[PDB]
Design a protein around this nucleic acid. Sequence first.
RNA 1: GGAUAGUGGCCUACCAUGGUUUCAACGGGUAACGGGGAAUAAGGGUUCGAUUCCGGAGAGGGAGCCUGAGAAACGGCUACCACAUCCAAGGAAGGCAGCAGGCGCGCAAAUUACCCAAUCCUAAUUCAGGGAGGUAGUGACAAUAAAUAACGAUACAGGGCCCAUUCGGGUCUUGUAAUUGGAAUGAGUACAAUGUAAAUACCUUAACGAGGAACAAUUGGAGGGCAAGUCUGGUGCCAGCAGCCGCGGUAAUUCCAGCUCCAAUAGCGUAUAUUAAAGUUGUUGCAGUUAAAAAGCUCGUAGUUGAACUUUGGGCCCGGUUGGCCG
Lengths: 144, 67, 184, 57
Amino acid sequence: GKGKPRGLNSARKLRVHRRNNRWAENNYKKRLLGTAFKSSPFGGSSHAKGIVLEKLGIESKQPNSAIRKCVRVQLIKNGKKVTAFVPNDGCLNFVDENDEVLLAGFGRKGKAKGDIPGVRFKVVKVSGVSLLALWKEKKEKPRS
Amino acid sequence: SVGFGLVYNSVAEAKKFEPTYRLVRYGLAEKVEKASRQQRKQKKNRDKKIFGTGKRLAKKVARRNAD
Amino acid sequence: PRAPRTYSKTYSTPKRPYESSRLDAELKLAGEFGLKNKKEIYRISFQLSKIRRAARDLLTRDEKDPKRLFEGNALIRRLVRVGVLSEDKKKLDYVLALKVEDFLERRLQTQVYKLGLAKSVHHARVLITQRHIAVGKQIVNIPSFMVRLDSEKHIDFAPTSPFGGARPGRVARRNAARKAEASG
Amino acid sequence: HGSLARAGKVKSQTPKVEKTEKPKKPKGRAYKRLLYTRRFVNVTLVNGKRRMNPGPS
RNA sequence: GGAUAGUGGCCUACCAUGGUUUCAACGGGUAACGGGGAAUAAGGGUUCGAUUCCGGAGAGGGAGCCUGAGAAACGGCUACCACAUCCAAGGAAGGCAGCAGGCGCGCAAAUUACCCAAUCCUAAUUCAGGGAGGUAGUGACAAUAAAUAACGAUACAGGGCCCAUUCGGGUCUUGUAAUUGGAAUGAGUACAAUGUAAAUACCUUAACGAGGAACAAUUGGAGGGCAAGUCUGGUGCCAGCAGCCGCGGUAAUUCCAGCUCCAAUAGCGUAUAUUAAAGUUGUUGCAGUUAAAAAGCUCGUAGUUGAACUUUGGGCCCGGUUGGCCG
């Protein structure tokens, strides 16, 4: 009988079985439990804003040997502390400290990308000026 | 070019039926310039706040200012 | 509040972007039919897929059904009017099997080049975008016109265009002025 | 730890090579024709793999 | 019986333990206003619907009311509560989840303009009033069309046929120049008129009006996935790239940079969701010996399913079809 019922009056049982077994999938479970709305530190948002706190020199994971040199950001909407990656070559001196920084995700649905452990969000613009523009020197951040 | 055109039997009917803005645009009539929408609405607000003709109120205000 | 006004898409990006065969074939067809961009083949494939799906869901229904007869007759009438298919074939095999190349080798951009009044598909495109060509009474400035033989019956040049007369033109006028100054 | 410095080291030591003067490419209806010519009239490398962008030998 | 415009535990007086419930009551959550509908479509489906129309609720939270045919009405009133304004210190004055605008908030969203002329509404309903509505402005959410100059005459990356004075040349040059230049075009201004409440969001006869330092176009990549460079300089497990596998430790095709190529063309890149992918939710249509998974075994209520049989059977005629043994 292939397990599951095969009767013309088993719609209730099939619907209930599917409803109970749908909880085994991570996406459906998280969506219906609202973990991204509450447990996630972005508040269920694509982008967030925060204040840079300090510099973090966490090392890479094997096989690799490099320093990613991320920053510490305290978000504004909820006040949670996070570690935010600074992507480009020489954007640390632009995103140094005490700036209204805008943060985005990595691209792994809330996981670390590569050799960077414990980080999930990256800096894409700082103090109204994009990190990409700062890197390409198209426009420079004001000192004030 | 393509447009609309209407011929009346007489100038009297043309004036009676044609819109006022159209008559002003053609030159067959002119509308006297008045205050703008905000200004006339504010005038209506002031004289709706004022009850009565207002002459007696103005006289009383002037008398109170004098004394 | 304002009543809604509908809009629709007209092109479909293909499911996989990098095919050394599909990209190469679409590049051949665009180059040999004078197509400045790739979204144009995308939209022509969108229309081809629409008409093919209409033919398929028409054919999936049993024979002699009046809805099938009416829809097939209307589709055949439109396709004969545009003219991509011979007007003495009612087997519907050609309209279902119509390919992008066959569809494109009938639109007016290939027609002008094959008739030779432009000598180049790119030259024809520049002429159209510069408005110095009128398919019929009204002067056209769009490359994608898909004449329905009305413009073929009414083939001519634009009145305010070269070889149409009544206007030397700005560059011609200044050339004449310079020649007059040089002569005296 | 201790490496919270030398940010963009190669970015700083990279020599600033300027942009070379070059005629502007024609984009629009022209670019497809230029690629048509560059692809279908070029038959130089068709021996074993039909290369399209050969490096300078 | 009362009350209601009347039905009714709607509210009062008097009986039973009556009503709902594993076919899920009740309770909790909803990052829930419900629909037409929105995104892929072989099918079956999975998400979304605050928002252009319908219905409902509210117009700071609650309540209670007058007028009125119709309001629990808030651009009506009364009173209390998160607020808040005006004193020569008694008192008075509300309420933009309506237009515009500001503050706070946040990744996130427009001018404190003009008109009642295209549409309709109200009034004594006909000459008035409508931030309803329409016009303009901002900002490229979407969506359709689509510029960045073709080309005459000769110098080659080496191309077809003849005179066969045989690898010297000719009715067309597949395609390149810092040589000469043959009809041409929009944007920005507009002796000028057209769209509108004469004015700029559509055209043209205009006059200024491309000649490639010109009216100049980029986003990321070139190891694979996935088409696209072992070309040069710099750094040297550092700085960095990297959706994943991985590159870089002195010849790095992967980092930064100069020539070439791609998604696309004013549109592309990134982030977060969601759909196909996903026959990794499986009704269609998944697996359970060893990859995760058969309850330790049995009984049993709900639930699902549940031998076979009853007029199975024949004769004639005809309103109606068949590319028909028929043109």
